[PDB]
Paper text:
The spike glycoprotein (S protein), which engages the human ACE 2 (hACE2) receptor (Kuba et al., 2005), is a major target for Ab-mediated neutralization. nAbs that block SARS-CoV-2 spike protein from binding or mediating membrane fusion to ACE2 and are promising therapeutic candidates. In this study, we developed a novel single domain (human VH) Ab, F6 that can broadly neutralize Alpha, Beta, Gamma, Delta, and Omicron variants.
To gain insights into the broad neutralization exhibited by VH F6, we solved the cryo-electron microscopy (cryoEM) structure of VH F6 bound to a prefusion stabilized Beta spike trimer at a global resolution of 2.8 Å. CryoEM reconstruction revealed density for three bound VH F6 molecules with strong density observed for VH F6 binding to a “down” RBD, and moderate or weak densities for two VH F6 molecules binding “up” RBDs. VH F6 binding spans the RBD “peak” and “valley” regions, with its footprint skewed toward the RBD “outer face”. This interface is exposed in both “up” and “down” RBD conformations, explaining how VH F6 binds to both states simultaneously. Specifically, the hydrophobic FR2 residues present a hydrophobic core that associates with hydrophobic RBD residues which line the RBD peak and valley regions.
Numbering used by the authors:
A (entry chain C): 333 to 527
B (entry chain H): 3 to 118
Amino acid sequence: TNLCPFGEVFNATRFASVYAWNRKRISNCVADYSVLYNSASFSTFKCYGVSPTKLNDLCFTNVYADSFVIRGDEVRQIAPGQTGNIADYNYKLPDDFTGCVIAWNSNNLDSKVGGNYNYLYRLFRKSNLKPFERDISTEIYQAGSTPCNGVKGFNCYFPLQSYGFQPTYGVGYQPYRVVVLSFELLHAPATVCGP
Amino acid sequence: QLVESGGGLVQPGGSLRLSCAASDFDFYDYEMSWVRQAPGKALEWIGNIYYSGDTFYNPSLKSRVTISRDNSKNTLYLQMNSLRAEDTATYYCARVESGSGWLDFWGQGTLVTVSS
Ligand SMILES: *[C@@H]1O[C@H](CO)[C@@H](O)[C@H](O)[C@H]1NC(C)=O
């Protein structure tokens, strides 16, 4: 009967990187989605398979909240059926995804004048991710018809890079915080409802 | 001509410092990384230091490895403590490209062996 902890998901001080995105299960509470849609902070509030104004009515099972930080011109890749670096190698959404992608500009929270280098994204993978698959395998891979035997062949590549977030940086490169709410629709007794 | 030092033989109860020097290019805005190659294994990534002294470490080696840099001295410092017998390797300082993950190994590599 108490409130679901949306305060501990959205207003958190530290978000994880997109290659190691945080997943929070939400269960055994009541969720008030009307504060999320009516808040003026969220630039992107795109719901697939539900309507944002109707979210106070449906009872759900085990709502997942996926929190991470990407750049501005990659928020379009947090959507079903998109292609990019984030969709292929960092965070994949299923084609039948029923949820809401929420994103707000956090330039004045996640940037430093020397560069906030604590946020990371995977540049390349041997294959695309499955839907909702987290790959934190921080290896060093090889490409170019020489193995990663050493420096004597062609050199090896490191998959994770850091966004060098700056305040001076133009929009589209500024840190955007993304929370992906994923719903599972009424397979069991539902636990999270609306008031 | 860039050189390196600090690599020798060391007991598994202590620590070591490793240094990469830089010459004939600017050691100002590059993203540098420390990797190692064990004998008979692949190259293992130890960590990297970014611009403005921010570090990202291997999760297996988070509590034993510290990486620093000095752009005025044009040097790259690794310090590693509580060493194990498997930690023996050839250690390489590399430069990470931006946008491509290409490691630019211009160091010759330092040989570190541990025993009693
Ligand atoms: C985050 O803080 C603001 C500050 O007023 C508040 O209005 C907002 O409701 C908070 N977010 C959540 C999810 O509680």
